[PDB]
Amino acid sequence: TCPFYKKIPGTGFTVDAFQYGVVEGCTAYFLTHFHSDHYAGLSKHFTFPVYCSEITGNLLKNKLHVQEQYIHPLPLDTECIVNGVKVVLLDANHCPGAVMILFYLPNGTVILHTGDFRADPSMERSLLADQKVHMLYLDTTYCSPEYTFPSQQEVIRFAINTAFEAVTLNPHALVVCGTYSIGKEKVFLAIADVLGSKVGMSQEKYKTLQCLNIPEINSLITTDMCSSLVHLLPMMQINFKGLQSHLKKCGGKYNQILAFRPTGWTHSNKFTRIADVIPQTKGNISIYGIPYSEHSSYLEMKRFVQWLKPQKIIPTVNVGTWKSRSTMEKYFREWKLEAGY
Ligand code: NI
């Protein structure tokens, strides 16, 4: 049964609520982004309206084969009327096509649902500046001060330089990058760009990338593995046994693999700066784990909420335990007391 925090009071609306069969009274279903935890339940057989971004809409059509009559894309930064209710989609700075949703309720109440998001100061100059928010449904994934990580720009600098050095020292080295869902595309794109290669990948992944409205994408990616010296593999294959196997398949083109695993947070961030990171090495193979997050750090989160000064806050991640729910109310109270709202 659909939980409370996926319902929008006073409306016929739910958010990211596809795995509970027919939800009593829902006249329209909102989808924040194309990640499996959120889209779970959707298929070709779904027959109620779905509202989403354009890019999310391309993925529903081409990857889950949802029928074109039921997909309702909306443009960002635009006031739209849906079943007699005003709504706005805003970029979440999460993965491609990911959005936050502003609802203007008939009774005068105003609701922000973040979906998944990495808070940024640029969000303070959106359509959010212009008015009050009464309830904030919040992505609280890293809501604890021990969760620190560097900026995206710092991580991408490290990866580029790491790659460029190794391949310049050894022209016969192959670079590999792990993936399992959409997001974090910049890692493999930036690396290929400094190396003057296209990125090689499977047909199922090529298809996926074609739905993302990336500029000049056709110049950047390819299905011809042999033409490329930056390869994508599924994340699970990024270990010593999986890579040794993959090297055999390249046929004496390459004598060395350097591989990158994009992770979220890991406990090694409590002690080690990004500059100081080192790889796990076995023979002619090396594997770097790098902390590229598309979710807000603790400080990023704290700033956004303190700026927004919402009247009530509802969490959407880490809700499943009493300890978690308790810890989150304590941080919300300190933030409220520190900023005076
Ligand atoms: Ni997500």
Side-chain angles (χ1 to χ4, degrees), residues 1-23 25-203 205-215 217-240 242-247 249-269 271-281 283-311 313-341:
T1 56
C2 184
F4 75 94
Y5 70 81
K6 295 183 183 280
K7 286 169 175 179
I8 306 300
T11 62
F13 302 160
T14 53
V15 177
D16 297 346
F18 301 93
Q19 63 169 310
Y20 317 98
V22 184
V23 175
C26 184
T27 54
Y29 292 81
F30 281 84
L31 181 62
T32 54
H33 65 292
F34 194 84
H35 273 171
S36 62
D37 272 10
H38 300 259
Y39 68 69
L42 276 165
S43 63
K44 61 167 72 182
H45 306 297
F46 198 79
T47 45
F48 297 98
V50 185
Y51 290 79
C52 63
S53 79
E54 175 171 352
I55 291 151
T56 297
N58 298 333
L59 296 157
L60 295 176
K61 185 198 165 156
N62 292 295
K63 299 289 293 178
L64 302 179
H65 300 289
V66 175
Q67 298 168 50
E68 202 146 45
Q69 76 192 136
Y70 301 117
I71 303 178
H72 298 265
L74 304 172
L76 306 184
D77 298 314
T78 310
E79 299 180 328
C80 302
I81 314 301
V82 173
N83 294 349
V85 174
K86 172 154 79 160
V87 304
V88 182
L89 298 194
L90 304 174
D91 195 304
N93 190 42
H94 181 54
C95 73
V99 303
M100 313 186 283
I101 312 152
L102 257 189
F103 299 92
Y104 299 74
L105 270 64
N107 64 8
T109 315
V110 178
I111 289 172
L112 178 52
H113 197 312
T114 64
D116 279 353
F117 92 135
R118 180 155 190 181
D120 193 72
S122 64
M123 296 182 176
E124 300 172 17
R125 287 173 288 283
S126 73
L127 305 206
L128 291 171
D130 322 33
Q131 89 293 260
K132 184 179 188 65
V133 175
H134 300 79
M135 318 196 77
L136 171 68
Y137 295 69
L138 182 61
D139 170 17
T140 43
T141 305
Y142 297 119
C143 190
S144 191
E146 78 279 17
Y147 295 122
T148 63
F149 41 72
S151 60
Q152 295 185 165
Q153 198 271 325
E154 282 181 68
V155 174
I156 292 300
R157 186 84 279 197
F158 174 83
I160 286 162
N161 293 349
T162 298
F164 182 78
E165 187 200 320
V167 171
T168 304
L169 286 173
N170 179 208
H172 303 272
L174 173 59
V175 182
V176 180
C177 291
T179 179
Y180 38 35
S181 45
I182 65 167
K184 308 194 194 198
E185 284 83 21
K186 187 72 188 170
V187 177
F188 56 74
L189 294 177
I191 289 169
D193 183 70
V194 79
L195 289 175
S197 170
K198 292 202 190 190
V199 189
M201 69 198 71
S202 75
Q203 294 190 244
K205 189 65 177 183
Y206 186 91
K207 177 170 188 193
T208 300
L209 298 191
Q210 288 281 173
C211 310
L212 310 186
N213 296 347
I214 289 164
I217 188 60
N218 286 339
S219 68
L220 309 170
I221 63 169
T222 185
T223 49
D224 182 10
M225 300 306 297
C226 281
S227 68
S228 169
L229 63 133
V230 173
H231 288 173
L232 306 203
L233 289 177
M235 195 70 80
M236 284 178 76
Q237 197 170 342
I238 315 295
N239 45 67
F240 296 120
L243 296 169
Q244 284 167 188
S245 190
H246 179 76
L247 190 54
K249 282 158 258 161
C250 305
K253 210 167 189 295
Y254 312 115
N255 55 25
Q256 188 188 339
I257 292 172
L258 177 121
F260 288 96
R261 295 189 331 92
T263 55
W265 172 88
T266 62
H267 190 63
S268 51
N269 283 283
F271 305 121
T272 311
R273 281 163 142 62
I274 189 57
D276 301 320
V277 170
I278 65 154
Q280 276 206 211
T281 296
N284 65 353
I285 301 181
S286 287
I287 298 181
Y288 288 83
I290 55 166
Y292 190 94
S293 187
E294 294 189 328
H295 289 280
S296 314
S297 72
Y298 172 82
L299 292 161
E300 288 168 5
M301 199 188 296
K302 176 166 186 281
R303 168 170 172 154
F304 174 84
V305 175
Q306 279 181 312
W307 173 81
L308 191 67
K309 302 179 168 62
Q311 277 192 7
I313 298 172
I314 300 166
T316 63
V317 189
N318 302 314
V319 301
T321 81
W322 294 115
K323 190 193 180 196
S324 291
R325 286 194 156 286
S326 164
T327 289
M328 293 188 296
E329 286 182 2
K330 278 173 57 253
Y331 287 119
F332 299 164
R333 178 65 69 196
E334 284 170 20
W335 300 352
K336 187 180 156 87
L337 288 167
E338 189 189 1
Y341 58 95

